[PDB]
Design a protein around this motif. Structure first.
Motif, mmCIF file in Angstrom:
data_model
loop_
_atom_site.group_PDB
_atom_site.id
_atom_site.type_symbol
_atom_site.label_atom_id
_atom_site.label_comp_id
_atom_site.label_asym_id
_atom_site.label_seq_id
_atom_site.Cartn_x
_atom_site.Cartn_y
_atom_site.Cartn_z
ATOM 1 N N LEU A 187 111.576 68.239 25.221
ATOM 2 C CA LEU A 187 111.768 68.421 26.646
ATOM 3 C C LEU A 187 113.214 68.711 26.977
ATOM 4 C CD1 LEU A 187 110.797 68.255 29.609
ATOM 5 C CD2 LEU A 187 110.977 65.786 29.427
ATOM 6 N N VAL A 228 115.359 72.268 28.439
ATOM 7 C CA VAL A 228 116.402 72.396 29.442
ATOM 8 C C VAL A 228 117.693 72.936 28.829
ATOM 9 C CG1 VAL A 228 117.863 71.159 31.106
ATOM 10 C CG2 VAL A 228 115.513 70.349 30.673
ATOM 11 N N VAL A 271 116.424 66.507 33.680
ATOM 12 C CA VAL A 271 115.178 66.786 32.980
ATOM 13 C C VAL A 271 113.946 66.826 33.875
ATOM 14 C CG1 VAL A 271 113.595 65.504 31.394
ATOM 15 C CG2 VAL A 271 115.920 66.128 30.745
ATOM 16 N N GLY A 272 114.079 66.361 35.110
ATOM 17 C CA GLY A 272 112.975 66.419 36.049
ATOM 18 C C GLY A 272 112.023 65.261 35.962
ATOM 19 N N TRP A 273 112.505 64.114 35.532
ATOM 20 C CA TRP A 273 111.714 62.897 35.583
ATOM 21 C C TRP A 273 112.201 61.942 36.658
ATOM 22 C CZ3 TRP A 273 110.858 60.984 29.869
ATOM 23 C CH2 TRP A 273 109.927 61.852 29.252
ATOM 24 N N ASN A 274 113.108 62.403 37.507
ATOM 25 C CA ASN A 274 113.660 61.511 38.509
ATOM 26 C C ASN A 274 112.792 61.362 39.732
ATOM 27 O OD1 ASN A 274 114.483 64.190 39.096
ATOM 28 N ND2 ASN A 274 115.963 63.317 40.533
ATOM 29 N N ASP A 275 111.817 62.250 39.851
ATOM 30 C CA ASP A 275 110.740 62.046 40.812
ATOM 31 C C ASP A 275 109.815 60.882 40.473
ATOM 32 O OD1 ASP A 275 109.545 63.129 38.628
ATOM 33 O OD2 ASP A 275 108.562 64.750 39.689
ATOM 34 N N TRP A 276 109.767 60.405 39.216
ATOM 35 C CA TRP A 276 108.880 59.266 38.854
ATOM 36 C C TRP A 276 109.482 58.045 38.281
ATOM 37 C CZ3 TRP A 276 106.916 57.109 34.117
ATOM 38 C CH2 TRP A 276 107.328 57.761 32.928
ATOM 39 N N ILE A 277 110.691 58.152 37.757
ATOM 40 C CA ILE A 277 111.329 56.986 37.163
ATOM 41 C C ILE A 277 112.329 56.412 38.129
ATOM 42 C CG2 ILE A 277 112.852 56.111 35.332
ATOM 43 C CD1 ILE A 277 111.460 58.450 33.612
ATOM 44 N N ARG A 312 100.021 57.425 35.368
ATOM 45 C CA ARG A 312 101.072 57.194 36.326
ATOM 46 C C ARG A 312 102.397 56.867 35.653
ATOM 47 N NH1 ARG A 312 103.372 56.979 40.636
ATOM 48 N NH2 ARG A 312 102.710 55.896 42.536
ATOM 49 N N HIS A 369 103.812 63.148 31.842
ATOM 50 C CA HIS A 369 104.923 63.686 32.611
ATOM 51 C C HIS A 369 105.683 64.782 31.916
ATOM 52 C CE1 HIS A 369 104.444 60.074 35.151
ATOM 53 N NE2 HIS A 369 104.930 60.878 36.078
ATOM 54 N N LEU A 382 105.599 69.206 33.092
ATOM 55 C CA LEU A 382 106.752 70.096 33.088
ATOM 56 C C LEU A 382 106.579 71.152 32.002
ATOM 57 C CD1 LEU A 382 107.643 67.656 34.773
ATOM 58 C CD2 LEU A 382 109.653 67.465 33.330
ATOM 59 N N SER A 438 112.584 64.233 46.258
ATOM 60 C CA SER A 438 111.391 63.747 45.590
ATOM 61 C C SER A 438 110.986 62.500 46.303
ATOM 62 C CB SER A 438 111.660 63.457 44.126
ATOM 63 O OG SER A 438 112.128 64.640 43.544
ATOM 64 N N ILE A 439 109.804 62.533 46.913
ATOM 65 C CA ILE A 439 109.428 61.412 47.753
ATOM 66 C C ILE A 439 108.907 60.359 46.806
ATOM 67 C CG2 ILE A 439 109.189 62.642 49.941
ATOM 68 C CD1 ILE A 439 106.134 62.620 49.411
ATOM 69 N N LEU A 440 109.363 59.124 47.023
ATOM 70 C CA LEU A 440 109.095 57.992 46.162
ATOM 71 C C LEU A 440 108.219 56.956 46.849
ATOM 72 C CD1 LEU A 440 112.813 57.551 44.044
ATOM 73 C CD2 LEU A 440 110.695 58.699 43.612
ATOM 74 N N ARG A 500 114.371 60.403 46.928
ATOM 75 C CA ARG A 500 115.549 60.816 46.169
ATOM 76 C C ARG A 500 115.948 62.234 46.253
ATOM 77 N NH1 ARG A 500 115.044 58.320 40.263
ATOM 78 N NH2 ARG A 500 115.210 56.160 41.021
#
Ligand SMILES: *[C@@H]1O[C@H](CO)[C@@H](O[C@@H]2O[C@H](CO)[C@@H](O[C@@H]3O[C@H](CO)[C@@H](O)[C@H](O)[C@@H]3O)[C@H](O)[C@H]2NC(C)=O)[C@H](O)[C@H]1NC(C)=O
Ligand SMILES: *[C@@H]1O[C@H](CO)[C@@H](O[C@@H]2O[C@H](CO)[C@@H](O[C@@H]3O[C@H](CO)[C@@H](O)[C@H](O)[C@@H]3O)[C@H](O)[C@H]2NC(C)=O)[C@H](O)[C@H]1NC(C)=O
Lengths: 156, 201, 80, 104, 104, 80, 156, 201
Positions: free
Chosen positions: D56, D60, E16-22, F41, F47, F51, H12-14, H20
């Motif tokens: 991943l 990037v 990396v684009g995981w900041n929407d979930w972590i 989740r 995840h 991507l 990004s809605i949390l 965020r």
């Protein structure tokens, strides 16, 4: 058989069985002799063994043995020379297309010949004076040096 | 027109009776393949005894196992290829020499006599074992007045490997003595020689 | 109690980390292995190491006297 | 554009110089892993979370390299050699044959 | 001419684009393995017998490639994210951080 | 009983092994993942996959009406 | 306050509290009114709510609400338009630099205005005839359609 | 001369209260680093209520967490950088909208009257909750003649989300009735309104 000693005299001896011609710090030569006709006193040589004893840095130990009808141009271990590749300090050669072989021990200025004559073997050795006499005492029984014990002699 | 001979011939000694030979064929696609009905012929011999003739083996692999060799003996090895009608001459000959083995024959030609001038001393002469199987590092002389005495109750006299005659002093006159000899090398002790009877004067 | 080839390798590695630069240490490694030789009889790492060293031994390439010194005597034993 | 797979590999011990010590076999089928580790595969498993995170990251920033195709499962085989006394020893060598590849 | 080592690698989850979930952390130190696997090293371990046999084969036939530098030991880290109900979940992810490299 | 992303991936892989060649199957994979969505989740593979698909979605690039139809009325509520 | 019905007649009503001007299948308009001076019958409007009901494919539901001194140019959810990006089927605009706002519901040819006058709100609606009359029955209480109940009227 | 503004601004809605924001600075070495005493300033606002003014935050990271937002509300976001004296203008503004929350106020302005011409029927009018927190999917009307009756023993009348008036028929004349209403959305039921007393004629 007929013996010529280092001291240049002839003798005819029985010396049936195993007998040391030489037995010194550098070399051993051993012969097995046997009656030329049964019940006879006159003998001939059917086995000849030589041991070129190890000379530090020049050759490791090597051993020639030949017998009636098996006269190889190699030592028992199959080799045709001693130690160093570049040094032929000891080497063995076939001669007279196989009918005798000769060993050059440069390291001890010694030359040895073994030959098949009919059903037996002759032996000849040429050796430096001092090295011949190098034998430690009570190692006295060497036919080339002292000759045959009197009891073992045909000519009374 | 004439086929190349195999090259890079090597011996790898595996035991006193056994060496593996390997070789390369530049004829074949490298690293590596065998694809046709060609074969290799392997030959091998020593110099002892006088005038051995060669031994042969046919093989379809670039490796052959040579068995049933004499111990402590240098052998030479060469290989040729054949493909239908065409054969090659023999390869560069490569040498390899078998490991030692404990000796397996007794010393030969045990000969016993009394010494000139000193009758209480006797002299033992002998010849090495025909199956010495390795550099002889010594002999052992056994003697007894009772030929049947258990072997460990005989007199034991160690002796160096490079001497085929030896003196034993201080015996009784007018006495039968009996003698056995045995050989030793780097791998151990060989068999005992036949008892030889000798009587002092 | 067994094959100590692991030590030969580590020692070699440390020395190399620090012309005949390697070759000092290659010859050392090679000695080391020969000294654990008989313990490593069936050891895969040892047998590879052995060929491994001699591989590097190639790149860079690393690693009167007897004749007698004035007269002679003669002895012989003859058949007739 | 290969993608991580197992490929065959027979190791001929003459060809490699182990025939002086291995009585048997003449060689063995070791195989080897080779091939790329892209966006679905390094996902696919067997793969470590790390391998996933790495591929991943590669996606990037290609300065960081993709995961690597390697053996992830191996088997043992038995081989023969001689002891001090020229007697046979049968010995079982772990991790000799590749039974599966993956990205790491 | 590097030789198989661990090199650092911080994975920024924004990058990396995981900041929407972590929820946390912002990223983590994953590291990665890289470097060659030559004649003493692949010997050195941790390495599999296979890796040894392979590098030896490479040394005879360079068509077969050398062993590969990969993570041989990894650790876990905890991370945070939200459930269906916007409540926190703390979850422990195996094999995230490289604690050691080796040849395979 | 939990995240079935593993199935989405395998299915995708099989289809790919066999222009908008990939894109048929990419869009399928992408649907699949969204359907196991809420189970995955906290799932790392999910995840990344998400991507991962949209990475490949870029290469190759894949994936009057309301106005009223004649008179009007008016209502109001006013302050003064 | 002063009501002008769809049928073009005026009425002045008390209608204190919460009251539906419209309540049909497309639109709801709801006002809260309050006495202009305490204990008085005369009232004014201090809250106005509109619900643009969902029209499949054109806009999802949106809701305008304004009150004395809070007259936004957006729906409660913060948005300024309904559904499609390319279609402005429903949108809301500020006018007279903020002093009133107007909503264009193209999808139902309806235009709605809300304005602040001093401390209260006025409301104006222009709507297609048929769609105005679309209300299901017993949903009869819509001031714009029927006017005020008589009891709620200032002029006896 | 004038510093570029940050780009690639994303929300990004949390949660219902939390989004965020992230952005990119082309100014910096790529993939990625922050090395100097520059800072980012983040601003955010909505349209409800009328004339909100912006909120601010200073941050040294390329990510900021915006908390304490109204539910079900669209917010806009932009970022500027400053480095000592030089600042940039604001970025491309990016929008993001918070998730729903269960409603937290009751319906407002509950107004009750009898129907013209039919006195056994009453009419309930009301206004939505000011803290609806999400699209209202329905209301629930409660009524009783006994204002103190336990809430579950009152009459319960479900009602659609898009109607602010409703009719209840078939009541008793000359009777005090009491009314409470409550709101519901996709996330559940909000609080009950104050009881409103009304007497039939
Ligand atoms: C090793 O391989 C060679 C080459 O294939 C073998 O040579 C072949 O051996 C057979 C048997 O000696 C030969 O048979 C011939 O048969 C005829 C009668 O039918 C007879 O007149 C012959 O003199 C001969 O015996 C065959 O021709 C011969 N072929 C060649 C090319 O030499 C050999 O037998 C193999 N031997 C060993 C010991 O490995
Ligand atoms: C976000 O960061 C900016 C930029 O660093 C901050 O601006 C600075 O804020 C302080 C406090 O307001 C200013 O102090 C000044 O002090 C003098 C008296 O000593 C007074 O005359 C001023 O009017 C002013 O208050 C400082 O000059 C100002 N600098 C800049 C470049 O704007 C800001 O405070 C931060 N705020 C938030 C809420 O994040």
């Amino acid at each position: 058989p007929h013996l010529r000693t280092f001291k240049d005299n002839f003798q005819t001896c029985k010396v049936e069985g195993a007998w040391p011609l030489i037995d010194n710090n550098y070399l051993s030569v051993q012969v097995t002799n046997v009656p030329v006709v049964p019940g006879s006193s006159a003998t001939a040589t059917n086995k000849i063994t030589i041991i070129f004893k190890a000379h530090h840095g020049c050759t490791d130990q090597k051993v020639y043995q030949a017998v009636t009808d098996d006269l190889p141009a190699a030592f028992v271990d199959g080799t045709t020379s001693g130690g160093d590749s570049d040094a032929k300090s000891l080497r063995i050669v076939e001669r007279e297309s196989g009918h005798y072989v000769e060993m050059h021990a440069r390291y001890i200025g010694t030359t040895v010949f073994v030959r098949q004559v009919g059903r037996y073997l002759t032996l000849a050795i040429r050796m430096p004076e001092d090295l011949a006499m190098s034998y430690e005492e009570s190692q006295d029984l060497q036919l080339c040096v002292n000759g045959c014990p009197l009891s073992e002699r045909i000519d009374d | 027109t004439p086929m190349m001979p195999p090259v890079g011939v090597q011996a790898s000694i595996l035991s006193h009776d056994t060496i593996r030979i390997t070789w390369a064929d530049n004829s074949l696609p490298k690293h590596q393949k065998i694809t046709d009905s060609r074969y290799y012929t392997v030959r091998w011999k020593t110099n002892i005894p006088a005038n051995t003739k060669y031994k042969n083996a046919n093989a379809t692999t670039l490796s052959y196992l040579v068995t049933g060799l004499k111990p402590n003996t240098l052998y030479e090895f060469s290989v040729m290829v054949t493909k239908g009608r065409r054969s090659s001459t023999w390869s560069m000959t490569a040498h390899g020499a078998t490991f030692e083995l404990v000796p397996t024959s007794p010393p030969k030609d045990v000969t016993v006599v009394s010494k000139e001038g000193k009758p209480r001393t006797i002299i033992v002469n002998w010849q090495p074992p025909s199956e010495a199987n390795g550099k002889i590092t010594g002999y052992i002389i056994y003697y007894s007045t009772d030929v049947n005495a258990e072997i460990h109750d005989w007199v034991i006299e160690p002796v160096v490997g490079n001497r085929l005659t030896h003196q034993i002093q201080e015996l009784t006159l007018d006495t039968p003595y009996y003698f056995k000899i045995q050989a030793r090398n780097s791998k151990g002790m060989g068999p005992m020689s036949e008892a030889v009877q000798f009587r002092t004067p | 109690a067994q094959c100590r080839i692991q030590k030969c390798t580590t020692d070699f590695v440390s020395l190399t980390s620090h012309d005949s630069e390697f070759c000092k240490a290659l010859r050392a490694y090679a000695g080391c292995t020969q000294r654990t030789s008989k313990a490593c009889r069936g050891n895969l790492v040892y047998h590879s190491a052995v060929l491994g060293i001699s591989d590097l031994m190639s790149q860079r390439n690393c690693s009167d006297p007897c004749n007698y010194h004035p007269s002679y005597l003669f002895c012989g034993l003859f058949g007739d | 554009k290969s993608s991580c797979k197992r490929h065959p590999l027979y190791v001929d011990f003459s060809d490699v110089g182990w025939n002086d010590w291995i009585v048997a076999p003449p060689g063995y089928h070791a195989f080897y892993c080779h091939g790329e580790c892209p966006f679905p595969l390094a996902d696919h498993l067997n793969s470590t979370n790390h391998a996933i995170v790495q591929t991943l990251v590669n996606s990037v920033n290609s300065k960081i390299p993709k995961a690597c195709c390697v053996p992830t499962e191996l088997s043992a085989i038995s081989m023969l050699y001689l002891d001090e006394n020229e007697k046979v020893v049968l010995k079982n060598y772990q991790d000799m044959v590749v039974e599966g590849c993956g990205c790491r």
